[PDB]
Each structure stands twice: as C-alpha cells, then as structure tokens.
Write an enzyme that holds these catalytic residues in place. Structure first.
Site, PDB file in Angstrom:
ATOM      1  N   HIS A 196      -7.309  15.821  29.803  1.00 46.30           N
ATOM      2  CA  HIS A 196      -8.734  15.891  29.484  1.00 46.30           C
ATOM      3  C   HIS A 196      -9.172  14.805  28.498  1.00 46.30           C
ATOM      4  CE1 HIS A 196      -7.750  18.552  25.871  1.00 46.30           C
ATOM      5  NE2 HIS A 196      -8.752  17.849  25.372  1.00 46.30           N
ATOM      6  N   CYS A 228      -5.858  17.151  19.719  1.00 42.99           N
ATOM      7  CA  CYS A 228      -5.266  17.272  21.039  1.00 42.99           C
ATOM      8  C   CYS A 228      -4.269  16.149  21.235  1.00 42.99           C
ATOM      9  CB  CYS A 228      -6.341  17.239  22.125  1.00 42.99           C
ATOM     10  SG  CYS A 228      -7.349  18.722  22.133  1.00 42.99           S
ATOM     11  N   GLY A 232      -9.967  16.732  17.870  1.00 42.64           N
ATOM     12  CA  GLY A 232      -9.233  15.483  17.903  1.00 42.64           C
ATOM     13  C   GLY A 232      -7.734  15.601  17.688  1.00 42.64           C
TER      14      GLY A 232
END
EC number: 3.4.19.12
Lengths: 303, 303
Positions: free
Chosen positions: A41, A145, A143
């Site tokens: 993503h 991730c 952020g």
C-alpha cells in the site's frame, strides 16, 4: 540478576532500513541484498485505502515511480513485483550492510523485537509478541508502515513481521516478509475486528520461573494440579490451553529451579483465582505473557 | 497509536563495545576514538573486591597486562590511566565506528537505554531510569560490567552510565563515563544499602498524559488540587515532591491534551488514594514512572 523486557540489539537491522516514496506516500522499506521490501500500500493514497484494487493501481506505476533512499544514498529501482501484500523493489546496488538473514513466519505467542522507523530512519526498539488473535500491541504512528520485527540468533537475523495496519481498536496488524498477513486481516481501511485476546499461558509460566530465579517467590504454594484441572481454570480466564508440548518446552526451567511444571501451574491457578493481593512479581502487578521460555533462558544465562 | 517502553536504536553503541581482559577477569569496555573505557575493577579478582586498594593493585599492571578485543580485531594498549572509578586504556587504533558522542552525568529520574553485553558482545537493549536513590533496576549477570547506558539525539550519543556493581538487594550501581558513581556507592564488595526508592512523580504524570493521548481516559476526574495539597499526598506515598519546574516541563503535554497539570495531579491523587480498582492504564496495573516528559513527546510524535 534482575529481569527486564529486552529487545535484540538493533544495529544489524538499522543498516537495512530505507525510505520508500511512491507519489505522495512515504513509508519504510527493508533493503536486503539487491531487493527492497515494503508494504504494497505504498502505492495507495488515503482515498485508495477505502477499497483498493492493488493490481489495477500497480499498472499505473513504473520502476521510476518508486524512490528509494538509504539515509542519503539514492538507490536505482530496476524492477518491481507484487508478492502477496508486499512489493519487492529490485535495485541496482546490493546492500553492503546485509546481515545473514532468514524470513520466518512465527507462531502465535512467539516474541520478537520491533525497530520502529519513520521516513526510513530508526526511532526506537521494543519487544512484543504475536498475540493469539494475530494482532500485536505495538507503538506505530503514521508513516511507521514497513517497520519490521525480527529475532537474532548469533549472527543471523530472522525477519518475521512487517507493519502494515492500525485497526480502529488501536492494535496492529501486518505480514511476514513474504507478504502474507498474520491472521484474517487485509490491507484495506475497513472494519476489522481482532478476536479474543487470550493470554499466552506457557509464557506466563516461563515468567514465573524467571521470577523464582530472581528471588520473587511469594506466589509459590503447597498445591499441585493436573493438565486437565488447570485448563478448566485457564478456559475461565481466557488463557490459552496448556499442552504437553508446552510442559516439555518448560523442562529446562523446571530442572534449574526444581519446581515441577505442574506445581507452577497450581501457583498460577491460585494467582488467577485470588489475584495478586496488591503485590508485585518482578515489578509487575499483572501476569506478564510476553516472555517465551527461550527468552527467559536467554536472559537468565546471558546469551 | 499505542505506547511502549522503547529503547534507542543500539547500533551506534554496538560498534563501540569491546572485550577487556586483565589477568583472570573479563568485562566490557567502550571504545571511543583511541581510548577504551572500562571499570577499574577489571584489575581485581573476586578476593580483591572485598577490600581493594586500586592504586596499589594498579602498580602491578602494565600496558601489556590489558587485552582488548573488538570482536576479533585485537587492539594494542599503549597507555593506561585511572580516572575516578574507570580505567582509560589508550590504544593504537582509533575506532572507525566512533559516533558523535558526549559524556553526560544525568539527574535522578532521567531515563536512558542500556545495551547489555557479555564478553564484549551485545545481548540486548532495554530502557531504564536513574532512580531517586541512585540505583537502577537493570538486568545484569556476571560479566555485564562495563555495559553502558546512553541517550541519542539525532546523531549524537550521550553516554551517561557504565555498569559496575550489583548490590546484595539485586539492584544495580554504576558510574558516569568520568568514573564517578551515581549516589553513595563504591566499587567494593561490602554492605551497601540503597535508600528509599521513591516514585518519579513528574514521570508518572507524563505517562498519564501519554495514556490520555492514546485513549485511556477512565482515570480523569472532576477535581483539581494545588501543588502544596498534592505534595502532602505525594509524601504519604513516597512520591517525589512536584515543583514548578516540573509543572513547566509538562507544559507541552498539557497544551496538546487541554488538561491542566493540576487537574492531572488531582487524577493521580485519586489514583494513589483509591488504587486502580483492578483496571489498567496503557496495559499496566501500576503507575509507571520510567517515561520522562520528553520520552512521551518523542514517542507520541515519532522523533
């Protein structure tokens, strides 16, 4: 002596963290040899996350649409592929800091260290566990991730987790390094409920062994129990059922302390039925379940 | 979201850890530029530790009596000096991995990361605090001496602690990197009692602010208090007195949450007088005091 929730030294993994930018989205990637791994993503906007069709969104992305930066050295992306829920970005430079590593998919109840990162830079390290409902209770802000979880054996980093999602309940979901989610979760911004967060019984027992080794003994009692009798109590308190494999895993701690596994189970039973009465065990007022038997052995022998 | 006891990434300090051997004693040293720092009781045997005269024991040691090893690269010792309770071993090679660093002597209540090491090799990292009685509650087994504690700001490692001693009560004592002990402790194997382990009030409040930011709100009440009125309760519960400097340090967290410092004090007062009633705050059944206000800001903004 003393007993602490301890993470693995993070330096081997710091050397692998990179920043990945695709259009307007910035998250963290993991650079091993000439491949950068990151959540798929990265290609989504916040609007995309409501209902993404990743194959369709990926058609609009070329090698040059992915910017990868290791501190300040820019890596050239020469190929890209989607594997389950991760993107593998092939780059022209092998990471000189690549440690010996493996990809492993852990079992519920196993623990690991998380290196929290933002914009490709490490901010901190902490130890957590894969919960039996396949969430983790981490510390992840926007952020983070692409931050990864890992274990280390001597010189080999076993990567087991990459962060993808915060559920509406504030717990966290992610994948192994092949991009398969742990549990039923998916990389879409929809209602996803976790499931019963049961307690990792075998880990509680190991921590009670750790407590005995370190002088916290007040919870030892005169009773014993049986596997079936304990598990009746375990079920009532949303504890995982204890199996003979678990008893066996506890063998070395049983041997060092001279306390039979079943006697420790009877101490835990009394602790579940009666509470701690305002006392503490190893500085905690609740039963700790984020230490595996191997964690306790490692820390109590100084591996 | 979520909130975790988080250590600093350890890689910058891993690159500085070495093994130091003097005769029969092995502990850890810290290699910065062309100096290796280690506890002066590297020169002692266990018999020596009962009543050491370090100046006299040091006369019998020459440069070649100190073996220093960074993983496998052997460092040549070309000079040695005793500074307070540390030895500075001058070596012929500047450490290529030396980060930007400072030596700082912290105040009681300040937190830092410990990189636990054995034989010069890192085993784990965890966050602790300098207690108001100048002990730390660490995890240190035999041979961990010379492990260091540190904070990191961007690229600068501030070293604040080097481990020297386990007291008979199982808590830990050590020095700053100039070799001055924190507190009244000394590097001799004698009876050393700590003092009252009071709770770090300003840290508890910061953690309550952290809890509010993360959705744990049940402890917020309708009352307020005053600095003097709260401190009367603080004294009763062996909490550190709260000062106006502390109120000021809490200002940014007060502003973000819209909860006045004094209103949070009244929540803590009720928590001290009434207990948690079997509830948890951020997954803890007791009041946590190992997060400074700055720690909470750092983790809640992702520094």
């Amino acid at each position: 002596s003393g007993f602490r929730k301890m993470a693995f030294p993070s330096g081997k993994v710091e050397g692998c963290m990179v920043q990945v930018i695709c259009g307007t989205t910035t998250l963290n990637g993991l650079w091993l040899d000439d491949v950068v791994y990151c959540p798929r993503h990265v290609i989504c906007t916040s609007e995309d996350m409501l209902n993404p069709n990743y194959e369709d969104l990926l058609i609009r992305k070329s090698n040059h649409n992915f910017l990868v930066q290791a501190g300040n050295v820019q890596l050239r992306v020469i190929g890209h592929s989607m594997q389950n829920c991760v993107l593998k970005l092939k780059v022209d430079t092998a990471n000189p800091k690549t440690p010996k590593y493996k990809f492993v998919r852990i079992q519920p109840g196993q623990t690991f260290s998380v290196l929290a990162c933002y914009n490709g830079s490490p901010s901190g390290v902490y130890q957590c566990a894969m919960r039996p409902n396949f969430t983790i209770k981490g510390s992840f802000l926007n952020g983070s991730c692409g931050s990864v979880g890992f274990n280390i054996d001597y010189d080999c980093v076993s990567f087991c987790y990459m962060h993808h999602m915060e559920l509406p309940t504030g717990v966290h979901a992610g994948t192994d390094l092949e991009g398969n989610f742990y549990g039923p979760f998916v990389d879409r911004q929809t209602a996803q409920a976790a499931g019963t967060d049961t307690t990792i019984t075998v880990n509680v027992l190991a921590w009670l062994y750790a407590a005995v080794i370190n002088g916290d003994r007040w919870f030892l009692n005169r009773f014993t129990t049986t596997l079936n009798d304990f598990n009746l109590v375990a079920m009532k308190y949303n504890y995982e059922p204890l199996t003979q494999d678990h008893v066996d895993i506890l063998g070395p701690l049983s041997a060092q302390t001279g306390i039979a596994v079943l006697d420790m189970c009877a101490s835990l039973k009394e602790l579940l039925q009666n509470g701690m009465n305002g006392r503490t065990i190893l500085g905690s007022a609740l039963l700790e379940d984020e230490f595996t038997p191997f964690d306790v052995v490692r820390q109590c022998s100084g591996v």
